[PDB]
Design a protein around this ligand. Structure first.
Ligand SMILES: [Zn+2]
Ligand SMILES: [Zn+2]
Length: 235
């Protein structure tokens, strides 16, 4: 696998955290494969099926001062070239400014668009551009499921998204998408018509393919996924 591009992470602590999640779900995938091959049944209660956060839209321009994406919450993020992020909530009133922190890797600050700080004014002009184009977070109820994009990597066969809740999303050339969550225990298949279905990974392995989508070439995709995770874990 040869990454054509990826965002630059300047923080060693951030890189450690990223590598840990890559390591974590790769281990999970390998364990699911071991359960399939050797038949062990974990004492642990099975993973509750929960649809993960997904990236529904993204764009990688060179001349607009950032990478941008939309999430299934309809939140819009801009990943700026210095590695900071503005995450604009779908309500079009609140946003997070996310920057580096020497203790936690990333830190997020809560703002209102109506009370925009002057030192983020140009950031929000860029965010406004991408909002037009498209059309960490505490424990408050409105924010407890908030997620942002920590790292993306573009490969020829797929683009890989690493979300802040530990979910990994893989968009393949054939417009089949797969998201791995819950430490590699759950796989979410997103069809080319955006029909979303989530399964325990071990169940898909035993079945041999994604239910309802025999053309999705699951085993090749899972191999690519493992290669992606393995590579990113070495940084
Ligand atoms: Zn380990
Ligand atoms: Zn808020």
């Amino acid at each position: 696998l040869i990454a054509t591009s990826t965002n630059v992470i300047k923080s060693e602590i951030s890189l450690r955290i990223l590598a840990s999640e890559c390591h974590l779900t790769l281990n999970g995938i390998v364990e699911a494969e071991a359960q399939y091959k050797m038949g062990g049944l974990p004492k642990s209660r099975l993973p509750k099926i929960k649809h993960p956060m997904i990236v529904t839209k993204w764009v990688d321009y060179s001349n607009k001062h950032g990478f941008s994406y939309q999430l299934s919450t309809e939140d819009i993020g801009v990943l700026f070239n210095n590695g900071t992020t503005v995450l604009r909530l779908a309500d079009a009133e609140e946003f997070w400014y996310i920057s580096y922190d020497d203790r936690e890797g990333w830190v997020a600050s809560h703002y209102l668009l109506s009370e925009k700080p002057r030192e983020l004014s140009r950031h929000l002009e860029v965010v406004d551009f991408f909002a037009k184009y498209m059309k960490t977070f505490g424990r408050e109820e409105y924010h407890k499921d908030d997620v942002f994009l920590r790292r993306y990597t573009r490969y020829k066969p797929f683009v890989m998204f690493e979300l802040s809740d530990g979910t990994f999303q893989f968009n393949f050339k054939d417009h089949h998408k797969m998201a791995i969550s819950d430490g590699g225990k759950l796989v979410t298949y997103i069809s080319p018509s955006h029909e979303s279905t989530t399964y325990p990974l071990v169940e898909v392995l035993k079945y041999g393919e994604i239910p309802g989508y025999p053309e999705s070439n699951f085993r090749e995709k899972l191999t690519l996924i493992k290669e992606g995770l393995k590579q990113k874990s070495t940084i």
